[PDB]
């Protein structure tokens, strides 16, 4: 052989985990940002970034533990261990924002390294990939929320913080400051995911409802051969079932599976191009109508103007406590209080 | 308007039975595009290039 | 300088049931986006 | 009642001109079978 072919005969062996010649970008960058995230939940913390106790070491029991963000007064600078932000000395690197940018970029590059990976095994078995096409759902969520949402706005404090409740803050951020519900690009994504959740539930039912008596025992998935050319579900009784109950039915067994690929992948892509409007905060929280006679007319009483005062309940209540960067302090009769509550 | 009231009145998000639900839903989001991708991937050849590859077999 | 006949141009085959999917998809985008155009 | 003055132009071309694109292609396809 040569010099390079001996290497390409190494990484394409049948090792039990397949290492992959595209895996040398994955396996460093995917053990970091999993294990980079797993120190940020335990040991390194906030409270020098935006005044919060968000670690296991300060003692929050995982449903409010997160590696957070850098500070708001810090810009969009990538917090290198080696940069101006910190010049190594990672003690001071760590608690000055920083950590997450270690797992934001490595989490970005491993997602390149995983989508390079399922392209790479797809040629080795020769299989015509659509998993990499269906990973364009997941990669367009990550690079347009955790990457391209903060770069439209101010620096990476307004990026979501990596935890279960750090995401939950970023949820109620996007309710109040942007109205991320009721803009239409998000609402196709709820049609994508909940439409995707039916089409794996309803397709998971009927293959377990039309089965073909090759076993003589009582459980069904005994004696199903993997090297079996005859098809294990009916599709003639299943089409006869759904032409009667729902009235419409999948009259061929392909495009039943292409629709299950299509329905959550184009859900996330429509959801991905909404937050890039939110990145430059083209929010569409306001209707051009339905507001002038919310101003002139107290007799005009609707759910949308009921909903738009709820978002004022966000933006003047949590914003002194969410962002202590500006030191927002409020004298307790400037806050919108509805009544006795 | 209902959901923000339920987040207000008694706090939906920090509750594990809701958190088990989205784990079913986001799991059901992926497993639709996981199972539906790979049989669409591992389809056999019965057509040529110019037509739809969703044609070379008859229903049933 | 002189014309000929194409050895090309396969026609299109949009199905009856695939018309229903495309007609419905435009009409849900109609009932979604028409509020935002107002 | 206030209105944007141009959405009824916008959401009548948003619904028609892809659907009559789609309505062209069905009657394209269905007339091929029919034994000329």
């Amino acid at each position: 052989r040569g010099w390079f072919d001996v290497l390409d005969d190494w990484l394409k062996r049948d090792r039990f985990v397949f290492v992959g010649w595209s895996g040398i970008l994955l396996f460093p960058c995917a053990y970091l940002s999993i294990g980079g995230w797993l120190t940020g939940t335990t040991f390194v913390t906030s409270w020098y970034t935006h005044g919060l106790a968000s670690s296991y070491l300060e003692g929050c029991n995982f449903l409010t533990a997160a590696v957070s963000t850098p500070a708001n007064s810090l810009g969009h600078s990538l917090l290198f261990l080696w940069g101006p932000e910190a010049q190594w000395d990672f003690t001071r690197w760590c608690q000055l924002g920083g950590l997450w940018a270690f797992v934001a970029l490595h989490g970005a590059f491993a997602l390149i390294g995983f989508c390079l990976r399922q392209l790479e095994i797809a040629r080795l078995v020769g299989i015509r990939p659509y998993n990499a096409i269906a990973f364009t759902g997941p990669i367009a969520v990550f690079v347009s929320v955790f990457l391209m949402y903060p770069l439209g706005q101010s620096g990476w404090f307004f990026a979501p913080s990596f935890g279960v409740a750090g995401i939950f803050r970023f949820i109620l951020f996007f309710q109040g400051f942007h109205n991320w519900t009721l803009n239409p690009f998000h609402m196709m994504g709820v049609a994508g995911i909940l439409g995707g959740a039916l089409l794996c539930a309803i397709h998971g039912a009927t293959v377990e409802n039309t089965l073909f008596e090759d076993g003589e025992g009582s459980n069904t998935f005994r004696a199903f051969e993997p090297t079996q050319a005859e098809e294990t579900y009916s599709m003639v009784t299943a089409n006869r079932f759904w032409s009667q109950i729902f009235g419409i039915a999948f009259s061929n067994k392909r495009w039943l599976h292409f629709f299950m690929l299509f329905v959550p992948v184009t859900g996330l892509w429509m959801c991905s191009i909404g937050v890039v409007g939110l990145a430059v905060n083209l929010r569409a929280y306001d209707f051009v109508s339905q507001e002038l006679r919310a101003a002139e007319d107290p007799e005009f009483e609707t759910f949308y103007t009921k909903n738009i005062l709820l978002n004022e309940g966000i933006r003047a209540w949590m914003a002194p406590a969410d962002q202590p960067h500006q030191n927002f302090v409020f004298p307790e009769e400037v806050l919108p209080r509805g009544n006795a509550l | 308007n209902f959901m923000l009231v339920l987040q207000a009145e008694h706090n939906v998000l920090m509750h594990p039975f809701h958190m088990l639900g989205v784990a079913g839903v986001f799991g059901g989001a992926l497993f639709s595009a996981m199972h539906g991708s790979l049989v669409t991937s591992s389809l056999v050849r019965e057509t040529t290039e110019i037509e739809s590859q969703n044609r070379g077999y008859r229903f049933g | 300088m002189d014309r000929s006949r194409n050895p090309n141009k396969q026609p299109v085959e949009l199905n009856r049931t695939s018309l229903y999917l495309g007609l419905l998809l435009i009409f849900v985008l109609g009932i979604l986006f028409s509020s935002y155009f107002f | 009642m206030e209105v944007n003055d141009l959405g009824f132009v916008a959401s009548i071309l948003f619904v028609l001109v892809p659907s009559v694109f789609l309505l062209i292609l069905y009657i394209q396809t269905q007339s091929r079978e029919g034994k000329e």
Binding site: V236, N252 | F59 | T17, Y20, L23, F27 | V3, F8, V15
Partner: peptide, 29 residues
């Protein structure tokens, strides 16, 4: 200004009726 939904909503309901009556009947072969 108001009858632009009820135009396009009934077209969305009208195509629900035409998919139940005028579907392609799936023939086994």
């Amino acid at each position: 200004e108001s009858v632009a939904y009820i135009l396009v909503l009934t077209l969305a309901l009208g195509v629900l009726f035409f998919a139940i009556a005028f579907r392609e009947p799936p023939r086994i072969g």
